[PDB]
Subunit: 490 residues, 3 copies
């Protein structure tokens, strides 16, 4: 006649690691790391990304005429720029503060294009010949649709020209202009005239006065001339004045815009945009998951889990899985099934397995709480950003990089280390819970049963089902069987 203390086992082959031991098979586990993504770009909070097609952010916003598919009012949750986009700044030159412009654009929600300065604002000049082979449209010469390249009428001098616009709305306005620099004085004379020339732009809060910076330079996109492109934001209430007597690339169309209530982004990617929705949209695809870590990409919008370098974060929730009557010391019981820890008895009324409800449940609750506590404490994300840096910003670019890789290494370490350490605790907690049941039984039976050093106890007497249950509920009664016992123990 006997009773054993033992623990659950099953067919699982899932392994976890601990600080002490690797490749340890367990009965139950939860993987905390999401590794799967849909390789595409989806809507976020029901708002679609803007596909720039064969255009760059600059070609788009300056209105390169090969970018007409994007022309006009648009709204977007994020921007998708194709890596090999060919249509950008077609007439050669520099966009001043280009990287800050992109940051601005990435924080914008919606834009509304409108005519800020119609051609009629500039009088005594040629508003219809401002085109170049560098900016083609259907093979012929053309120009940015948001800028107007004014030149003199052949017969007349380039008169002083003036224009004003007042932002009377509540939305800020993003607008552009340029100064054209011919490669020599002959072209300068032809297009604008000799003498001092200036482009002046004035606001309540910005002031601008510049002239041609003539110089012979090698051709870029077929052109020896250049344009310095500038951008600015006319704030609500502000008024802009424009004066020039030459070399002005005037603002034509501009954008009333709103600033997103959400984090946005410009993704440089070739992934397709499809008709789908995503809670979490990363640079390298959409994630749909309840998990709390993620090794897909550090760059995203929406609500994503923390990025880490890990290939897995398998957290043990069950016991060491070790199958082979006999109790816990020789392994686990595939036959238990009921629960995690329990008993196996054998008397004249048969035999069988039964879990200890109370200790199984107390352990389930502690583990469930542990998991939720981990989920809770990992419920923040460091958010890397794809801002851009010029060739003269190596230092802050490197600063940003070291910072982003810094937090990635700390969080990866934190996550990996936590899983290793708590797994060891989880498995020790099992060993102890089993020990507790075994010891609750041992203390009760004293010398009315033999230990066997094995997890089971052999009764020195008869133990019916009502006796065996009296051991489970912890109300055994040593004296009743003490005499019967001692006679067989001697």
């Amino acid at each position: 006649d006997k009773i054993c203390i033992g623990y659950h086992a099953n067919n699982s082959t899932t392994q976890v690691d601990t600080i002490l031991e690797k490749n340890v098979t367990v009965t139950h586990s939860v993987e905390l790391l999401e590794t799967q993504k849909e390789s595409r770009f989806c809507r976020v909070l029901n708002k679609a990304p803007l596909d720039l097609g064969d255009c760059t952010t600059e070609g788009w916003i300056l209105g390169n005429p090969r970018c007409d598919k994007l022309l006009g009012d648009r709204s977007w949750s994020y921007i998708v720029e194709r890596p090999d986009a060919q249509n950008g700044i077609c007439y050669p030159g520099v966009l001043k503060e280009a990287e800050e412009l992109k940051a601005l654009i990435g924080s914008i929600d919606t834009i509304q294009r409108f005519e800020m300065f119609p051609k009629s604002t500039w009088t005594g000049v040629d508003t219809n010949s401002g085109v170049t082979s560098a900016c083609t449209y259907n093979g012929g010469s053309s120009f940015y649709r948001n800028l107007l390249w004014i030149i003199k009428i052949r017969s007349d001098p380039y008169s002083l020209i003036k224009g004003t616009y007042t932002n009377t709305g509540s939305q800020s306005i993003l607008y552009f202009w340029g100064v054209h620099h011919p490669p020599d004085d002959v072209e300068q004379a032809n297009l604008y005239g000799l003498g001092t020339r200036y482009v002046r732009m004035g606001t309540e809060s910005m002031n601008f006065a510049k002239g041609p910076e003539i110089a012979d330079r090698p051709p870029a996109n077929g052109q020896r001339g250049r344009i310095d492109y500038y951008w600015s934001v006319l704030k609500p209430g502000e008024t802009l004045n424009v004066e020039s007597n030459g070399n002005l690339i005037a603002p034509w169309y501009a954008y009333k815009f709103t600033s997103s209530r959400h984090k946005g982004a410009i993704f440089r990617s070739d992934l397709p945009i499809e008709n789908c929705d995503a809670v979490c949209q990363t640079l390298t695809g959409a994630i749909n998951t309840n998990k709390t870590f993620q090794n897909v990409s550090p760059i995203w919008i929406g609500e994503c889990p923390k990025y880490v370098k890990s290939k897995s974060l398998k957290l043990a929730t069950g016991l060491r899985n070790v199958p082979q009557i006999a109790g816990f010391i020789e392994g686990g019981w595939t036959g238990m099934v009921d629960g995690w820890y329990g008993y196996h008895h054998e008397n004249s009324q048969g035999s069988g397995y039964a879990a200890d409800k109370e200790s199984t449940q107390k352990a389930i609750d502690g583990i469930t709480n542990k998991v939720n506590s981990i989920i809770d404490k990992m419920n923040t994300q460091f958010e890397a950003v794809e801002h851009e840096f010029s060739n003269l910003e190596k230092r802050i670019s490197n600063l940003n990089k070291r910072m982003e890789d810094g937090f990635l290494d700390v969080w990866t370490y934190n996550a990996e280390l936590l899983v290793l350490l708590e797994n060891e605790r989880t498995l020790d907690m099992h060993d102890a819970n089993v020990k507790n049941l075994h010891e609750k039984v041992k203390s009760q039976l004293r010398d009315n049963a033999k230990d066997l050093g094995n997890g089971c106890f052999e009764f020195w007497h008869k133990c019916d089902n009502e006796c065996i249950n009296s051991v489970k509920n912890g109300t055994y009664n040593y004296p009743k069987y003490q005499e019967e016992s001692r006679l067989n123990r001697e």
Copy 2:
């Protein structure tokens, strides 16, 4: 006759959390997080902050004439700017590198104002008409007290003008100038003259050369003109040369300054400045605490505890409070209750109580020790063309805050669970030390107590406590009773 092993309990209702379970009542705990502050600004290392009143940092340092209350020599542990301050850059324009100037000013300790270039320096020009309705003083037109707005005499051309100053002291000098930009060529001709005009400033180590950038603009503060304001530091030994034939807003008064040996700050706040002292002064008030974390503010000067987002960090120092436990023990944490013919009573086990007290006190102090650093967020400012480094700074500051908060919260949960396991084990040890000694001269009861099969006097009971029991002496008397 009997002896029991048990543990302490009391009237405490304080709860802590562990990784395994929540809302666990304990006998003793220490709260590690400071959440209280005095909503005011105090002295730090016995030096008072500077209240800028109705002035902004810029109005102050350029000497806006409505800011005369701040004019002259000053010194401070930190600066308090009022959010709604109205007197700043009164004549419209831009202070170049304004944000870097503020960082500088925040690292300054004391300033001494002095006349760098008196009016007599500039000859053949009008040094007495340089005033505007935009910078008013008692209703009349005026101008910044640290700058001089020079224009031509009506009859004469604006002559080339020159001035030099040499810093012969050991203190650096902070000084200001500007270039005035009229809105059109007519005003330009009136005030300075036509042709190329320049403002040139030179030093052993810096140079500067700029002209008017004339342009039609809308009025701001009633004026279509603008001034680009500039600042710089003339180092000890250096000499400054100034040369212009127009558009120069010349330096007039400047500041010899010293750099603080301590971290300083500019707080934008409406909190009152009072006659008090603070070891730790945050943007949102003063903290006086021995605690090691703090959820008041990430921005401070003085010696503050680490900022975290947590609402509490309650660390268990005692046992699970379950009255189970013995409210009657009082002596210590773990111990005994005996009963014989000489009475009964409770008594703690000194040695195991003390060993556990020392381990916990060490744990607390070890935590305090390892958390004895602070990440220090700074209130530097960023222009509208510095969105990227501004965002970089923000993500960094929040980055450390999230790692330290996680570190702190997680540590408390994990070590609380260890603390409470250690109690369970210590109690079990005493019980087992007793059991092994008595063997079958006493009955277990499965209950924590032992019923003696014999008489056990106080001398016997004490022999069990000190671990020198003597089974054979009572073995006969014992075995017969069963």
Copy 3:
């Protein structure tokens, strides 16, 4: 007749700390922190650093004529600038974007100097009088070897001058120029001429047009004039055009360069450069170690361990050393001491000793594995107008340092306590395996040993060790006693 359960001890005096107690002596420990360095500069991936001697990075790269020891093709894994170097920008003025130039230079691995614009490119001007007392060479007046200071011939006007160069290679080219600003109109007229003057430089991707900004300024290095120095990179394929009628300090020699596949650095240090190799080279010396943390310096190139502020990170790998414990055990960590009529002796329990050795070894390696990453501080420079990003960089670097230090110190304290608890438990297990087997055929003694109520031969004692004891066989003989 008896058997005891006990644990190892030895002569070790090494101490570790735990979260619960301090100065705890243990039998074995591993120090995880490297504190030793060779105070010198070594080769890294077989390439030597470049010693700038008495020259600054700027004097070197502009070709200050007192820096001829460096002149020409060079290559390096890192640059060592001496703190007290005196030869830099000798004619007074400002190198634009100097700090970015240094970052560039730190990322370069080899340069090849060549004549970009020979003197013959500039016609109708004086290409042979461009010298100053501020830039001396053997006592006489001279000038940077990579720049040409052109002035007018006395009799003639300064003609418009032109030059072009096209980068037809695959390597980028680093080059320099300047604009000279005289201190007054008389010197201006003398050297270049009156009227508007300009210096124009053009490329497919950069445009430059500036004039003299004449002003009297106090003398620096004996000179009231100034030069604004500029630098740029002509990319492969690009072509540079130069046009001026005055005030041009022309490019003369420039550098084709290659970009390092590795992190480089400019170290400001007086440490000697020697014939050695270093896997890890820090600003304050070379480290050769297998350890995983390091308190030598946060600045390095090569493969270094993680920098921390700690003075030590001693991890317990053995037991509490308390000779209590058995100096006589030697075999292993946990075991037995028996005594019968066939003698006495000590013997370790192989299975439980080995399981503990493996768990600890794994713990150490796991720690090593998880700490196998480094935050890398950099010595980029910041101007006096970059206090904010300089402070941002500083707070960031000290931020990670504090987090990693905390992580490392805290981990050692916590795992040391776990390590020492695991020993206490393993010993207790052996003791309780033996107790359950013997029941009342032996006496506990409350002491760790068991006194047998019967005779226990070596075969009996081993039957206890292997866990197959046989209580009934000796139960009668026992009960008699």
